[PDB]
Structure formats: C-alpha cells, structure tokens
Amino acid sequence: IIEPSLKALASKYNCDKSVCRKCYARLPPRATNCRKRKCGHTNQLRPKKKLK
Amino acid sequence: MVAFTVDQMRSLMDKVTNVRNMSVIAHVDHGKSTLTDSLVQRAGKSTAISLYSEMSDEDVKEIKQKTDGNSFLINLIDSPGHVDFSSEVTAALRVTDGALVVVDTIEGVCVQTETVLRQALGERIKPVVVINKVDRALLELQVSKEDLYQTFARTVESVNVIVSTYADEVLGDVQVYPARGTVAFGSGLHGWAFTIRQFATRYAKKFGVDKAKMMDRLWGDSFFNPKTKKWTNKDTDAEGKPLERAFNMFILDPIFRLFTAIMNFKKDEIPVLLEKLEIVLKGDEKDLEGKALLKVVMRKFLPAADALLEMIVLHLPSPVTAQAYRAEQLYEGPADDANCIAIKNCDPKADLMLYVSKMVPTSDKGRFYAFGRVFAGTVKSGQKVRIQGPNYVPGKKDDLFIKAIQRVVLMMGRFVEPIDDCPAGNIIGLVGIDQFLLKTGTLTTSETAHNMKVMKFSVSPVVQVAVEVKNANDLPKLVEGLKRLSKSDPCVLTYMSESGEHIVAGTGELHLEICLQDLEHDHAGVPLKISPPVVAYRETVESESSQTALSKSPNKHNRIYLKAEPIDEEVSLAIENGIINPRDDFKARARIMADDYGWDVTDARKIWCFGPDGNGPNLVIDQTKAVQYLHEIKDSVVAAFQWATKEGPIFGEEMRSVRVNILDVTLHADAIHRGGGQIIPTMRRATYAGFLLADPKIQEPVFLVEIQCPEQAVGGIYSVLNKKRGQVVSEEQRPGTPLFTVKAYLPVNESFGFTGELRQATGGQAFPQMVFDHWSTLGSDPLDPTSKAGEIVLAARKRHGMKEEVPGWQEYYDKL
Amino acid sequence: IREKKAEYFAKLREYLEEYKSLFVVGVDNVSSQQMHEVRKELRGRAVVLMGKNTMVRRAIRGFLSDLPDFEKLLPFVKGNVGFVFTNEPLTEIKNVIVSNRVAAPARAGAVAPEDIWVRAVNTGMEPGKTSFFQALGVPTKIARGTIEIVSDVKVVDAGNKVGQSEASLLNLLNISPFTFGLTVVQVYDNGQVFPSS
Amino acid sequence: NEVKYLYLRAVGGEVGASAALAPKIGPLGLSPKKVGEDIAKATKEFKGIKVTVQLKIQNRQAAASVVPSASSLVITALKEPPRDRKKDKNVKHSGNIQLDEIIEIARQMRDKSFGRTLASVTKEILGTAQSVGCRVDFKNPHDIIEGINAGEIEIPEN
RNA sequence: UUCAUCUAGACAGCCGGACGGUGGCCAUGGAAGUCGGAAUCCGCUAAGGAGUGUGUAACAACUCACCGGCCGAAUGAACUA
C-alpha cells in the first residue's frame, strides 16, 4: 500500500484535476476555462471523477 | 516417516496423547499447498495427510499437555482458501483440534484469513500462525530488516485482534505471539522456516546464554547494544547512530546476509558464511548459483518442517485436551450423560461415538467412503453400530440404522490402508457404510446416544440454477448424478422447484460452476443444459369485483353470479399454517375466523372448499339466499374452483388470497341438466370473470435474506439492495464484534447474481443466507404487456406456449 | 453597512465611557465555544466586545476629540484581539479571563509545538481501533480485551505538523499537544496602559 | 465503576432498542434487558415522546436519566394524548402551549443555555416551539418572540 | 451598459473561528446540517445556514457560506457588440 501522505501527493497530480466536458482535457482543479483551442476555451468543466 | 507399517501406524494412533489433528487454513493464494508439500517432504478437496515428528525430552517437558513418549503423529487437513468452499474448512475444523493459519507477509491478514480464523475461533480450535512468502518479502519488496520486522508485528497484531474479538471465554490465553513460539516465519515455496524459539536454542548452543528470557528478548523492543554488552530495553538514541533490536540483529541478520551474498553472486563470501552456519553440500549442490543455491541453503539452515512440526507439537492441542472443552458444544445432549463424559475424556474403552462428516470419492461411482472422526470408544471392522441421521430423534424411531461396518480405513494422501480398529480422537475412513446417511451423521453403540451437532457453516446455498438433460432418455442418469453430487458436496443442495425443475443451489458462482462440471462429466455423465430457474408466481385480486360476474351453462339452463374478494394476508397465512384448515369442522373454524380474523360468522360457516389442491389459501363462500338444489351442484362447483385456483386466468398459475362469493345461482329442476359437464365449465368461467373483474394482480415470492458482514462493508449491502429492489428490515451488531447482521426482503425474481453482486460490493466480506419468506403483490397491472408485471406475464405465456394476449374478462362472461 | 459600523461605533463609545477598565485580550486559536464560556463566566463582571481592528482604530481616532486619553490604546490594537470592559478588580477579571484554557484536539496540518509522545498504557477502547495504531506503527497488544501500547513512540516530532492518521490516533487517545485561551496583551485603567503582568 | 456516559435518545415509555444500545455497551457489563427496562422506567414521565436518555455506567449498572431537551419538553408540555405513530406522516404537533409552561421549560433550560436572561432562554424555547409548529396563545411563536423583543410581553426576570 | 464592494480597509491570496437550544418536527430499518416532506426560529455573538460540499449504516471527522488576523487601492458581477 501507499502511505497516505504519498497517496495525497500522487493524487495531487493524478486525480485532483478538472476535465473539459467538450474535449476531455485534464485541467487544473481551479481552472475556469479549458486551455485547448479545439473546444473554444469553454468554461464547461467538471471535476475529475474520484476513485471510490 | 518411511511408511513404517500399518500396525506401527496403529500403535501411533494407540498413543492418543501424542497425536495432533490440525487443519491448515489461510487465504486463497497464501501457500497452504506448498507448505503442506514442504511438511510432507520430510514426513512422507481435503483429505488428511500424516506426518511423523520426533522430539527430545527437553522440549517434551515444555508441553502443557498430558503426554507420554518422544514421538508424535500429525494429521494435517489442508482446507480450501476460497469462500465458495467454506463448508470444507468447516468440516475440517469439526474433525480436527488445532489450526495452522498461513498468512502471506506481503498481503497480510486478508478477508478469507479473517473468515477461517473466525470459523476456527467459533469452533474452539487453537490457532498457530506461520507468516509465509518471506522470500517474496526479501527479494520483491527489498525490505532491509525493519520493514520486515514491522510487517511481522502488524500481521501478529491483526491476527491477535481477530483472536481476541472472536475467541470464546473458555481458553482466554489463546492469543498468538512470536515470543511465545506460536508464530513461525519462513518461505513455504523455498522449503524453509524458523521460530524465534529455534533461534534462541541455537544461540544457547552457540553462546551458552539462558534460553527462557532470550525467548522474550529476541522479539519486540529489546536491544542487545553491542560494543557495550548490556541488553537495554529502549533505544536511548544509542548516543548517536540509533541501534537495532535483537530480532533484526540476531535472527534476521544471518538470513539477510545469506540472501544478499547468494543473490548478488558473492561466490567467495558464500563458503565462509555457509561453514559458519554449518551448511553442507552434495555432489552437485557445489555448482549452484543464486536463486537455486539459496533455495537449498535455506532448507538446510532452517528446515520448514522442523520449525512447523515443533510448533504444532508444542502448542497445538491433542485430542484428550481439546475434546475436554469441545465435547460440550459438539453434543447437544446434556453434559451429565455418560456419552458426554466419554467424549470429554476421549477414552477408547467407552461406547463408540464416531462423527462422519465427509464423502470421499473412491474412483467407483456410488461408494463415497465415510470420512470422519471417532470421539468416544473404539471402532472395529465388523462391528454392529447404529447410523444416526442428521435430524435423528434419540427418543423415538427415526432414520436410524442398526447396521455393521465392513472395513475401517486409514485415509492418507490418496491411498487407503485397511485397519482393524481405531481408538477415539483419531481420523479414519469407513468401508461398507453410508448408503444409509445422506450427508453426515454419527455412528453410535449406545442406545440413548444423542446425535452430534449439525456442523453449521458460515456459507449457505444461495446461487440456484435449473438443470435439465438434453436427452430426455437419461433423466434417471441425471437423477442419480444429482443424488451423488448432493452427498459428495456438503454445501450443495438439490431439490424440485414449484415449477417442476431440478434446482441445484450452491454457495457461489465458482462453486456452482465446479459442481455443474462435476455433474456433466462425473456424477451424471450426460449432456445437460443449465438455465436460470423460472419463478413461481401467484394470481390474486386487489378489489371486490366491480360488477358481478355471470356465467351460463352450455345448455343455458344454469347460471352463476359471483364476485371476487382479496382475502387478507393474515387469513391466507393462517390457511397455509393450518390455523384455518379444511379438515377442521365448520362452526368451529368459522368461530376462529370470526373471532381472530374479522370474518363474518355466516360467511365463515358457508365455506365450501379451499383451493387449490383442496387446502390452499383460496376460499369459496356461498352467499346465495334461496337456491334450492345447491347441495347437488356443490361437488361440481368445488371441482371447478379447484381447477380455477390451480390454473389462474392470467398465465395459468395458482391463485392466492382469492375469495369467490357465489351471490346467486339459477339451476334447472332436472339433475340431468345440471351435471358436472354443465356446472364445472360454468363455475370456472364465472370464477375467471370475477377474478379478471376484481382488479387482477400477481404476487411474487420474496426472500428473507440475512447477511453477516463487517462494519466497513454494510454500504455495499445497502447499494446492492437498493439496486435489486431489496427492502431493509433490520440492522444489528453482534455484541463485542464489528460484525453486523442485516435482515432484508429481497424478491426471488431479483435474486439471480445477487450473491455475486453483494460479494463485489463488499469485497468478499458479506455472507448472505436467503430463505423463502412470503408473497408480495406486484402493484403494476399484469394485463398491460408493458407493465412490470405484464412483462413477466408475457414471458411466462411465451414459455408455456399459450397465446400472447391474456383473454379479457368479457370472455368467460355471458351478457345478462 | 455604514449604519452597522455606526452602531458598532456607538457601542464602543458607550463601553469606553461607561466601563472604567478594559483588557486588550488576544483571542488567536480561540473557539467560539471557548468565547461563549468566557462570556458566561464574565457575565455581570464584564462585557466583551470584538471588531475589526481597523474599525476600532477609526472609532478611537474619532473619539479622541472628546477622549484623547485613549491614544495609548491604538499601538496595542493589533492582531486578533478584542476588548473586555470591566468595573471590577483587575486581578479577579484577569483570572476569570485566563482560566478558561481548553486543550484543543490535535487537528491535522497543525505544527506540533513539542514532540507528541504516545505512551505505553492500556487505552481501554474496543479492539477494532488497532488500525489507527498500525497506521503509525505504534506496537500494540491486546490486554484485558483492550489495546495496550507496548512501547513509547514519538508520534509527531517538534517542528513538523500533524498528519491525518496521527491526528485520528491522537483524538482517539485524547492527546492534545496544545492548549488555547484568551491571553491578555494589555490592561488599561486610570487613563494608563500596562502589561498584564 | 467510572463516569462513562452514553447520550442515546429513546422513545418515551418504551424499552431502548437492543440494536441501538448493545453495540457500544457490551464490554461494560450492562445487561441489555436491564438497560431497556431502566430506560422505560426513566421515560414513563415523558410517555410516548422522543427523549434523550443519558446513561451513566458504574459497577455494571445504568443510571438511566432523561436529559431535558427543548423539543421533548415542548411535546410533553402540549400534553400530547398518546399519538398513533404508525398512523401517518407528522401527526400534527398542534395545540396551544402558553407563556407559563414555556417559561417553566426555559427555567429548566437556563442551567445549560448561554442566554443572558430568562427572556433570552424563553425566546430560544419559543424558536424550538415554532420549529415544532405549535401555537402560543393562538399567536405565532415568532410573533411572541417579537413581542418579547419589543416589550409587549415581559418575561419574569427570576 | 447597468448594478454593486472599498482607507470605517474592497477582490484575490495565506492563517484563525465557523458555536449553543439542537439528534429542531416528521415516514425511515437506520437519517444527528448534508436520501427526503414541510418548517427557515432563537440565543451568544466580531460571526456562523436548522447548513455549501466531501464523508458515515448512523455518528464522527474534514469543508464552505459568515466573521476575524496579514496586506494595502482599487475591485466584482450580469450584460451589450
């Protein structure tokens, strides 16, 4: 198993993210608009789904 | 053991204080089979295997058990790890006294480890723990010494938590400790293991220090503090460079040095360490490199059999000491009965009381040697004995046989040795018996000998399928295969459904698939198809026959006017339980129904018959005012009611909770115009019309399911119930343990795959048992094909070959 | 908004011209429950007023025209601090103020002032709490049907903060590494300010 | 033999659910049936009212004692002829409690409350009664609270 | 364009509190702010929703509205094309 502090550290980069609803880009958790041009920098973002 | 002699093995059984009956229990992939192979490499489904272990007087003195001699015989049963085969481990625990709990060091205490520990503790079996796959911990995870020690400590702590919360208040000190010598460490695959008792002995022989306190010093926070020669009790910071504990310094250090040298291929450093630890080589072991050299030098430096057998002998209870506290719970008969004291004392000269638990196949179909243990007295080949059934009443006659044993057999690693006699507290097989007891049971010589306990297991048959032969001609072969599988497997169940289907029920999907393969290939030997069982439903009413149903005879001379009513659930339950029975006399059954069920005394007196089959939960009430020839058509009306309540008008299922009130009849004066051929169709059509006019509904069978799962996994139970329309009834917690008990109502329709979904939601920690409880009325209309009940009605009609559309109430109804 | 600030100014004026003495008290890390307890003890004996330090400074500045004396309060109205106004013995009031110290739970992510030590004792909780101990590696054993720490363990060292597992175990064992209360920064009376001591 | 405390809440006049009491007090020694009957006795007063029944464990004995609760006291104050719980959703907590009984309840609450005056405690209990949905003098408890705030009705400052 | 906050300290940022009546009333098997129906109160308050979310079987434990400590001058929102 992973020690909880290292699990939180890894989750910071792997799980604590935003996802664009239009282009699925993995985005910073506090992003207001997607950084991708293909989606027109849309503000339609959701949190990345948490495992369990 | 060199398989000395059958008679020498008989003498070993005669020495009963020097025999250890134990079961190896663990998680699924934790090592049981490889550790048993390593135990039999120096001593020679679940059948017992025999092990021979010598001992010196110094360690024989250190045994808190009555004993005589220096030699011991270990009967080891290797129980299956899977949850789907928990009945085999339950039987092994019933037939043994001690337990070897194998725990993998990487995975620690897992779900099935906790399950087998809980079963052993509930059966009052003393555990001893072996932490396996230390080679995996040393080569895969690259723990240096302190991670390994910490993992050992955590494993011991978890095992002792389970032991403390599930051990009965009859032993108390049954906790497991490496300091006490009840925990071993080693690699079953590589064939090596050790005990800190063994290391304390080796260091007493190498340094001359006391062994008694070095036992408790080689484990825990005990530091030798070298370059100072003072056994400190804490780190004290070591005045710079904190120091290591005795376990790593003295026990783990030589093993890790050997591991590092051999696996790093330090060919010049191998011989010096090997000579220092006194390992000798063979003709071809000199030219052995890493991963093959260490594998033998560990078997030499620390024999796994020599550690495990010494632990088993020192700590695991002998039958004479285990039956003392196990006889009371293995015999429902009173504790003041000569058979109970005989089992407690394990005296071989008392009356015979032998518990047969397993059916071992014999390569001949239909013999199935009776595996079990004799708890009192001595069994003899050719001895008159009484077979007692699992439900045998000892007062009166029951399924009890007066038969004789044909041959007492010694069961071993798949070879049977005939034996003339076997004393109490030993493991043997029986030849020439068991065509007399289906599953289990006791063989007694006393005439007032209560049957032993029923061997309850934590699993139950919950996954049910229907089986039908493809070739209709070999149905006898299917029946024979079903009957032989129902005795080979202890936890498999076979029965007939309400729809006339052979139903095989098993613990889980894997166990059921294994049983079905055994049926298809060994037990039956014929090609059969497996399907989800069809569910038996009931046809009922939920209103009061909005308009009166009228039916005319084929000759038009007789008419029936009636109505349908929803008989109350309490009344239906009383009819099914026999409180309201047809054989009871009217005006007393009427009084019971009036007083206890709100019925009108006149209506309850005017009860013509019950349906279906003459005793079902449907009633016909004669409310007619002044009909003249009513007694003449009573028989035909009863016959038609039986027909209608056997084959309902929706999809031909039995009626339930239907009350047909015959309000009026018109009859022809001549008896020739109101015979059975005129009244029976008229009455069944009128009953069908009244049923289809009184808001027809169907009722489904609902299981009562109670699940035992820990605190952490009840959420999975609730999610599964909410996904399969379950209704939670009650939640409880076992006092002192985190094990809950969730009782709920799950419809039988939504019960296929329920065990698998529950096990996936709870991670294999939930244990459900399910039994038919009651009928629930489906609120949806069964006449609309798109409704929830209408889909099942349509499917049943298709399967039965009837028409698609359910005939309307206008049919069976004559306009007048 | 402005009306509310004016009301606060008026309350401050009444307190500063009706209560003879006042304690500038720091309230950092002081729970609302702790403040309620302090107020309940100080019922009658005193009255507590809190506010935004900037608004207090503005109010006092405006007041100065009439009451220039309060000009020594301004250098001490800084940090998370409030006022306890009293017409009663200074020592008694100060004891009532700093006597309510409450051992706060070892919330995670809070720097440990000292080296938190778990001690070898019989904690006396249900055995199903061993997971918390194993999460920190505290060796334990079952005695009298309860978890008992075998050897002393430094759960947190001085200088670092408390992790979630450490916090959970400490809260289970009721081990608070710090205590919080309404310390007194300044006492003012007779037209003069002085350190609490 | 200690000051151990369990603040469970039971239905007045009835024994406490075994599933609700056994899980925590099973090591201590308290026989669940004894705990149940003790709770029933302690709740006889508030017959048929959800009441917090505090329990002290000493020498394997339960000191079942109903800790006063605002809502529970209000319910008993309306005198609440025995409700049919099974009957229907939220059998209405209608009726008319009065200043006298609300003041009595506030007097029983003052010890633990943090209001400055018994007037404040009465306003608290009045908010509880308003949530419950009962009536005061056929006037909204919020209206009575406002009356207290604006002098029309005066709480005895005892 | 319009409406707002702001040296009586705005926005953002970091740190502290985030309570008491109270597990408010009700089916529910369980529902304690956080499955839901209605009720949106009072107290102490500088301030805290009969609760913004995570979480529990229920608790618990975190979190946010709201108020404070630091900083010190502008800032926020909805729209228009």
Ligand SMILES: CO[C@H]1[C@@H](O)[C@H](O)[C@H](OC[C@@]23C[C@@H]4[C@H](C)CC[C@H]4[C@@]4(C=O)C[C@@H]2C[C@H](C(C)C)[C@@]34C(=O)O)O[C@@H]1C
């Ligand atoms: C412990 O063993 C028990 C339990 O597993 C359970 O009670 C099981 O139930 C069987 C059923 C019994 C129901 C009543 C008798 C009326 C309808 C019957 C069922 C549906 O058709 C519901 C359960 C499930 C079975 C159908 C779906 C095949 C039943 C059957 O026998 O047909 O019976 C076995 C013998």
Ligand SMILES: Nc1nc2c(ncn2[C@@H]2O[C@H](COP(=O)(O)OP(=O)(O)O)[C@@H](O)[C@H]2O)c(=O)[nH]1
């Ligand atoms: N490295 C290592 N592998 C092991 C050990 N014991 C068992 N295994 C592996 O585990 C696998 C299956 O284990 P097995 O003993 O058959 O499981 P069980 O008998 O059902 O408990 C085998 O392929 C072994 O290689 C061990 O001590 N060390």
Ligand SMILES: [Mg+2]
């Ligand atoms: Mg195996």
Ligand SMILES: [Mg+2]
């Ligand atoms: Mg919730």
Ligand SMILES: [Zn+2]
């Ligand atoms: Zn995007």
